[PDB]
Paper text:
The [name] was crystallised in complex with a 23-bp dsDNA fragment (23AB) containing two out of the three repeats from the bind locus. In this complex, the asymmetric unit consisted of two molecules of the DNA oriented in opposite directions, and two molecules of [name] bound to each DNA molecule. The DNA molecules are in B conformation, with an estimated curvature of the DNA of ∼25°. The two OBDs are positioned on the same side of the DNA molecule because they are all bound to the GC-rich region within the 11-bp tandem direct repeats, which are separated by a complete double helix turn. The binding to the GC-rich region in the absence of DNA bending causes the lack of protein-protein interactions between the OBDs bound on the same DNA molecule, in agreement with our results indicating that there was no cooperative binding of the [name] to the DNA (see above). The binding of the [name] to the [name] drives this latter loop to move 3.16 Å away so that Met86 locates at approximately 3.0 Å of G8 of the top strand in the [name]–[name] structure. This movement includes the 180° flip of the Ala85-Met86 peptide bond and results in the extension of strand β4 by four residues in the N-term direction. The interaction of the [name] with the DNA of the bind locus occurs through the major groove and involves residues situated in the N-terminal part of the domain, namely the N-terminal tail, the α2 helix, and the neighbouring loops connecting to β3, α2 and β4, and the extended strand β4 or anchoring strand. More extensive are the contacts of the α2 helix, which fully penetrates the major groove, adjacent to where the N-terminal tail is situated. Regarding the structure of the [name] bound to DNA, it is noteworthy that in the [name]–[name] complex, the active site is not found in the vicinity of the DNA.
[name], the replication initiation protein of [name], is a member of the HUH endonuclease superfamily, which includes proteins involved in the replication of plasmids, bacteriophages and viruses, as well as proteins with roles in DNA transposition and in conjugative mobilisation of plasmids. These proteins are characterised by the presence of two conserved protein motifs: the HUH motif, composed of two His residues separated by a bulky hydrophobic amino acid, which is responsible for the coordination of a divalent metal cation, and the catalytic motif, containing one or two Tyr residues separated by several amino acids. Each monomer of [name] comprises two domains connected by a short hinge region. The C-terminal or oligomerisation domain (OD) is a helical domain responsible for the hexameric state of the protein, while the N-terminal or origin binding domain ([name]) carries the catalytic active site and is in charge of recognising, cleaving and joining dso DNA.
Numbering used by the authors:
A (entry chain B), B (entry chain A): 2 to 132
Write the structure that this text describes.
DNA sequence: TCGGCGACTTTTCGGCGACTTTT
DNA sequence: AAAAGTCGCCGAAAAGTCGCCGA
């Protein structure tokens, strides 16, 4: 009895993805919203500069499918270590604001807040359609 | 069978806790109330002026959980030796005023009275809701 | 007596190949 | 045949109680 759902978020690392990863993700025909790059997140480790550059993708599947469905589809796309920690997204509004660290979880924990503009929306991601 | 309860008090020693302990207690997401620093308690031994610096944390679990649980929950958070003497609290109010030694028993036994201003409330600890 | 800790138990949840349904 | 999708099944950690205490 795995959970089937429409909204997912996962991480992409610049190392494990090919050059054209952006055009690579457009192919699937599914609305995505790709956070700006996270080169400046404070690590929960002493003396430690920042966490590694990563992305937060917000993935809007067209029908209820399972976490594993999405992991594998992007594992085919970009390399089997391309992504990590695919999760089911419960509140879309938050996990969109979370790409900027400008949700309330993030500013409450005072994390470094990125630029609205660098978010990349693939196949006409409509924030309003899902809220 | 051990006792289940929602209200707890335990002690925090500044030596055994990391710099960012205060913020790390906020992570647990639980209403806490942290005594002002207890650096001038009268020691019960002759020629011993003060007791070792401590804090009294006042801890409100979201569901009746066991003394031991809270102990694990905090060892893992601040270090195996971070805390001490976790007990269940039967009257919050009295034990709230005890953080300043302004309860009945504290003023009764002539304990050193600290300043409210230094009390720290974590996650919107609202003493009034508890009476 | 009653706070304590290691041993244990129990959820919790994200992986990943293997099997299965869909195209 | 191939794509996509889910199904067992594993592991680890974050949680929790239990056993015995021990001063
Ligand atoms: Mn991040
Ligand atoms: Mn004290």
């Amino acid at each position: 009895a795995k959970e089937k759902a429409r909204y997912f978020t996962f991480l992409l690392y610049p190392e494990s993805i090919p050059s054209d990863w952006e055009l690579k993700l457009e192919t699937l025909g599914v609305p995505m919203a790709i956070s700006p790059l996270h080169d400046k997140d404070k690590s929960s480790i002493k003396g430690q500069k920042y966490k590694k550059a990563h992305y937060h993708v917000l993935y809007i599947a067209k029908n209820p499918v399972t976490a594993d469905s999405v992991r594998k589809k992007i594992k085919l796309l970009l390399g089997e270590k391309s992504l990590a920690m695919v999760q089911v997204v419960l509140n879309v509004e938050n996990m969109y604001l979370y790409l900027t660290h400008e949700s309330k979880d993030a500013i409450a924990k005072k994390k470094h807040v990125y630029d609205k503009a660098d978010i990349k929306l693939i196949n006409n991601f409509d924030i309003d359609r899902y809220v």
